Amino acid sequence: VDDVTGEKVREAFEQFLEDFSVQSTDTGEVEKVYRAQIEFMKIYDLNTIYIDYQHLSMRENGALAMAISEQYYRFLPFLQKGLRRVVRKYAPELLNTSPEQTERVFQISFFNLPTVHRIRDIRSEKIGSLLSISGTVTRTSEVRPELYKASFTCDMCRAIVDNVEQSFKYTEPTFCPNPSCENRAFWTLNVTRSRFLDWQKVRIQENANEIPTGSMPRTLDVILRGDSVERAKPGDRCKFTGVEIVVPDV
Amino acid sequence: SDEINELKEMVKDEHIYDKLVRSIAPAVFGHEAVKKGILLQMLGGVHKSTVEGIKLRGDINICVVGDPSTSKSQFLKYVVGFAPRSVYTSGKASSAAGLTAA
Amino acid sequence: SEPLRIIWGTNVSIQECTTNFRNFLMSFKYKFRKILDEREEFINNTTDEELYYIKQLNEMRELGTSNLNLDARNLLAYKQTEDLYHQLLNYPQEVISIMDQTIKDCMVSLIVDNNLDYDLDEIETKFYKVRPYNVGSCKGMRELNPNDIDKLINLKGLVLRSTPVIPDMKVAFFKCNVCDHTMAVEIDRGVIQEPARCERIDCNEPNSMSLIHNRCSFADKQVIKLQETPDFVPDGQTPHSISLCVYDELVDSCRAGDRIEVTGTFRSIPIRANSRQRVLKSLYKTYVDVVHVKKVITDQDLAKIREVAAREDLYSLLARSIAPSIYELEDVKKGILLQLFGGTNKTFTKGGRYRGDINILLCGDPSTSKSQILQYVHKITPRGVYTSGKGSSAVGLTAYITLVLESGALVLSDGGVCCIDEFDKMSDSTRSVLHEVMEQQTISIAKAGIITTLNARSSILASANPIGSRYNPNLPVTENIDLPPPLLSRFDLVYLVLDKVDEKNDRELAKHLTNLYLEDKPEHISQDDVLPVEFLTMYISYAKEHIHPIITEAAKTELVRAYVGMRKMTATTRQLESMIRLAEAHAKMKLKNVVELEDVQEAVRLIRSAIKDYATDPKTGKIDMNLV
Amino acid sequence: ARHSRFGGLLSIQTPDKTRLTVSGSQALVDEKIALQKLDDSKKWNKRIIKAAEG
DNA sequence: ACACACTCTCCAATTCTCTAA
DNA sequence: TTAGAGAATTGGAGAGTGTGTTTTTTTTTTTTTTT
């Protein structure tokens, strides 16, 4: 079964990356800034791309921006698929990270959203939407490796399982793929073939000047990944953007 | 570029020192001596060490004593409202653990 | 004839409840309620004939809002719903649902029948909810019994604390691991109805579907802790508390120290012995499931307020009406009235913010009725606290580490008045806490694991007796009061009240107090003309919200002159600011937008009168008792 | 409109005075939904038959 | 010993195929 | 064209087996001995 909205969003975001076609800061000449940003990334072997929400707002009567805003968690994989093709088209040197080289895990980033919420304004109706938040940092965790994609091999026979997907808990295969063996136990995680990510936990509390009458400040836990770990510092004031999520009792 | 131009323009002035002293804590009437002291603390001295490895302190500590209604807390309020790295604490409502580390 | 729908275990038919409530909703008019009320004479024939709930529904449509209040007495006024009133109390879960689906259908019917421009899809998308209230007599928290389970209840109390918002699941989302088919499933009775096999025809496989947490749908839940009011506690015992569960609209409504009345179903549930197994305990947990919360305008109100403000005797009228049964003490009453109004709050782009609040100290002889006055202020103010000197610690008065931070008296009292009695009994250690809160109206904290600053826009009203416990005329006034100068400098008004013997005064006082015992429950009152407490509260509240006086140049000249007069001779710089603040409070009380010469002169006069300055020896600082 | 644990209980009486029980708040008002929800609880489905390869 | 999770086994319910009237 | 006799495939009833369980601060109110 296939989601048509995802494919149409994918190949519309593709066209935005191709031909946003803003004119120069000094002259009436088309500049194509996002293609230039891809070239810049190629020059310096970067892994993240920044997009302006105002540029997306004016595109195609705003429907694309609405779909990205209200259903970010559904559409984020399709946005990744859309960007991969464009980088292949104009800068295939960026697709890889001598023996063979694994693929680059690109990160899309957004800024200049219309409004900033307080920690006190987080409510369950907004789960999975795109938001921006501000507060004072009070604690930070050390950087830890998070398992992103896994690969296992069987003890009772020479067989391998690859690209197993994790979500919130450490997860392992359901069968031995070789039908000559039935053992489900004694898997081992191949640290060379599997892939990890950088992960950091930080904790924030409300701005003192914003607290309402007779009340006290609430707090929140925030997750940082990739090239943004250790950017935050205790006692500083920061502004964040991302999506709010819901975490189980593992 | 415009920031550099503005900074150069005020750097060139003959009367810059007096204007700087006069611009600390605008709401407080008089007490130019304390304002001058606050400016010099904010700028600070030069940190250094000797061949022996001993360090020489490069910064300035200040204390203000006064009888009531002398507006002495306004200086602390201005400093904590202005200086980029600063914290305000009350001697009654704080602990040694909360002051250093816990 | 046909199958029927029946509330389980009742033989009540849903058709009758639906039709009766529809008829009530589309034909009730306010005049019927006045028939149940004491007189037909009250009726305004023009207004009271109107279809009240149709008017409300039109407003809901055009204001874009989703909830309808309903006081249950109207169900008794209309003849067709006299029995529905009882059925509501006995079967709330079913009856309330019936009412909801009635209101939504009526809203649709209005736009399609009156053929209006509004989007039908928009109205179909929304949820509409009734919120019944004023159901009957309130019930004591300890007197709820196991025969009240699942019936509607009404409670009064005070709010202790609220937990943060909890996400509550409402719809589950499944996805097939092999073929990527998806299904949305409805949650009822807390159990997820997971499919046995993937429902796509060609992928009919077992264990094939799986849950996706962050594509589910959730709703807000919160728990509020309500405490028993002292009016109901048994003799020689301490108050109890009960927990309220609240959802969606009402979630963040209420703060610590609030005083409320609620309405909700009284529920009970089992609890498990361990998290591994289905074993339940024999005792059941109990709680309340609220559907409405209430705190304990018209052109006629504005007309009354403007007309009262035009009276010549207004200042004396308001002052003698805050505490009607207390004899004389007019200057004390006046100062307290100006504390109630307050100054104006000011904030600059730079140079800070300046307090509008007034601090008052009452000091003098025993039996002078100081503490009796504190009772009136504590009950008049919308928010506030009363406490005693030996009852208070430094932590309890401000804030408490518990890792979480918790509120004390001055924080609960924010925006209100904090009454402190036996002020002379608390230690110098505890009193030193008040310096920062009175000067800045903020509380700074720096302890293990917590460092922050909190707001405290709190007015202090204090009561004390002098050193030696009776005022000694052989010592100067500052030595009789005996507070240290850094703390005595922070009060806007300081009053001396003295137990001076005089036959003229004593006969009047004796006649006043003995007159209260001529009746069982007295109707007698000290004066012919006083305002009711409700209307007086309305006046003060409106004047606080709408009026914001400014300094006139004339007022500036008089303030400078007056300060130099008190100064040249001790008056500190705070005497100037407190004069400004008192003059502003006086201006609000007349509903003026400007401070004038008259207001400045009243502020000066009241300061001179409070500390008996005219009777003070200007050089020795002693008071001539003969001049009092 | 209201949450998943608020729900009351419904009874439906047939001809010949026999009664059934269903839960949830929408069943109180919508008989079509109640009738459909009633049959949906029942466990069995008949198992099924199935052309091309190579 | 008392609820649970998981494995094993046998038996009959079911549909498919062939034959003759 | 119906139907009835025989063979093959599948479901889950239910029986069995193994398993897990009880159980150094830091902050704040109060009493007591010590200078």
Ligand SMILES: Nc1ncnc2c1ncn2[C@@H]1O[C@H](COP(=O)(O)OP(=O)(O)NP(=O)(O)O)[C@@H](O)[C@H]1O
């Ligand atoms: N002017 C008055 N009007 C009304 N009651 C009065 C007056 N003067 C004294 N009383 C009565 O005398 C008693 C005063 O008690 P109280 O309010 O505690 O006075 P106080 O100033 O707080 N004295 P103390 O607590 O000893 O410092 C009460 O019963 C009052 O009703």
Ligand SMILES: [Mg+2]
């Ligand atoms: Mg008293």
Ligand SMILES: [Zn+2]
């Ligand atoms: Zn194997």
Ligand SMILES: [Zn+2]
């Ligand atoms: Zn499937």
